[PDB]
């Protein structure tokens, strides 16, 4: 909540941008992990009685 933010951003928010890119890659990477471990076969057969 600092009253100057644009100067702070243009001087040091690019490191945070790169690290946020790293976290976004990790997040999409975890989603792809869940997809490849649970969706090996994409066929839905209903449970028989």
């Amino acid at each position: 909540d600092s009253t100057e933010c644009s100067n702070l951003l243009l001087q040091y928010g690019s490191f945070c941008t790169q690290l946020n890119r790293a976290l976004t890659g990790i997040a999409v990477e975890q989603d792809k992990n869940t997809q490849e471990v649970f969706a090996q076969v994409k066929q839905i057969y209903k449970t028989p009685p």
Binding site: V28, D31, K32, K42
Partner: protein, 38 residues
């Protein structure tokens, strides 16, 4: 959605294989004029 509120795309009831990971069971694609669908 459970992930958040989405503005700017048209929701469709039918489902396809998705390439843009949104989250909370929702995905995005650009095919339908032509507009982004969720």
């Amino acid at each position: 959605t459970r992930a958040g509120c989405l503005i700017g795309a048209e929701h469709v009831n039918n489902s396809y294989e998705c390439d843009i990971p949104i989250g909370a069971g929702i995905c995005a694609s650009y095919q339908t004029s032509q507009s982004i669908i969720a």
